[PDB]
Structures are given as structure tokens and as C-alpha cells.
């Protein structure tokens, strides 16, 4: 119900070469699971509960074809941990 205001100084800046840029700081959203019945639920299934975790155990790989972009996370073993049983793969295997 409340519009986004700017002040007079900012308006004067816009009345020039100056342009507003948009940056996305975060995105909330849900994933789907099946409940005890056959129904798919996406209500309490918050993606932000996994973002930190996935980023901590993964390597980032991004493919840029010029027009499209594809971003991936591939799990990798923790270096010092003897109890980490994540299989080791090469960069080529991970890309494939």
C-alpha cells in the first residue's frame, strides 16, 4: 500500500545521466516434498535453510555460453577430515 519515495536531491540526480541500479541481495523460496499422503507440500520447506550448508560443502561451477548461464554446486570432500567420505572426482568429471 505504500509507494517507494525519493527525496528532492535524488530526483534532481535522476534528472541527469544518473541511473538507479538494482541488486538482488537474497531470494527466499520453497522446495517440494511429499507428505504421508501423496500430496506435494511446499509450505514450511524453506530453501534458505540449505543455502549456507550447500555453499559450505560444494565447489561452484558456472557455464557461460554467451547468451545463457548455468550455475552448479558439486559436493567435494573436506581436506583434513578423515571421516568425510565424499567421493573424489576430477574437475572434468564434475563438469560432465
Amino acid at each position: 500500500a505504500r509507494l517507494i519515495p525519493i527525496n528532492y536531491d535524488q530526483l534532481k540526480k535522476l534528472d541527469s545521466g544518473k541511473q538507479i541500479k538494482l541488486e538482488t541481495t537474497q531470494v527466499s523460496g520453497n522446495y517440494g516434498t511429499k507428505n504421508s499422503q501423496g500430496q506435494i507440500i511446499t509450505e514450511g520447506n524453506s530453501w534458505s535453510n540449505y543455502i549456507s550448508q550447500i555453499d559450505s560443502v560444494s565447489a561452484s561451477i558456472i557455464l557461460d555460453t554467451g547468451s545463457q548461464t548455468f550455475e552448479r554446486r558439486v559436493a567435494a570432500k573436506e581436506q583434513g577430515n578423515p571421516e568425510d567420505k565424499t567421493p573424489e572426482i576430477t574437475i572434468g568429471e564434475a563438469i560432465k
Partner: protein, 96 residues
């Protein structure tokens, strides 16, 4: 040898002396496997959460917690604890 007063899946004898986690099981510490990357843990046999954080001694030691938690806090004596601050970068005044 088999007695868990605090019911945290680590025997009292193991908590008093050293222990480590192998295949999700607490085992009595032996120096023989210090050089394979295992760490010696100690904790209170009367407290399930020695550091007072939301995770038990077993959960921390076994790493069966949020993977974004730093490995320091896998030690039962070191608390899983976020220290969050706010910094101001600039201030904008709109004279109405």
C-alpha cells in the same frame, strides 16, 4: 566402560578421558591414530551440552550438525555461537 549418565551417546569413561568419532560411533581415544587426522575430544559426562550451545557433545564431535558451522565448533569445548554486528556505511537525510 558402558555407562552414559547424560544419555548423549558417549560413555562416561570416554568423556572423562579422550575419545574420537569413527563411522558415527564414539570410540576410546588412542594416540596411534592421531596422525590419521583424528582429534581427541573431552567433555562433561554429566552434561549433554558441555558448551551450552544448542548441540550435544555427540552431535558436535560427530559433525552431525549444520555443515556451515566452522570445524572449531565441532570440539565439545568450543561453542557454536554467531557473533553478529552491524556497521553503518552512510546516512541519508531527507528534509521534508
Amino acid at each position: 566402560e558402558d555407562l552414559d549418565t547424560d544419555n548423549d551417546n558417549i560413555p562416561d569413561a570416554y568423556e572423562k578421558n579422550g575419545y574420537t568419532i569413527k563411522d558415527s560411533i564414539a570410540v576410546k581415544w588412542n594416540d596411534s591414530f592421531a596422525e590419521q587426522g583424528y582429534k581427541k575430544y573431552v567433555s562433561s559426562y554429566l552434561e549433554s551440552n558441555t558448551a551450552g550451545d544448542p548441540y550435544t557433545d555427540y552431535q558436535k564431535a560427530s559433525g552431525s550438525i549444520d555443515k556451515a558451522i566452522k570445524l572449531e565448533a565441532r570440539d565439545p569445548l568450543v561453542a557454536a555461537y554467531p557473533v553478529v554486528g552491524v556497521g553503518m556505511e552512510n546516512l541519508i537525510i531527507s528534509t521534508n
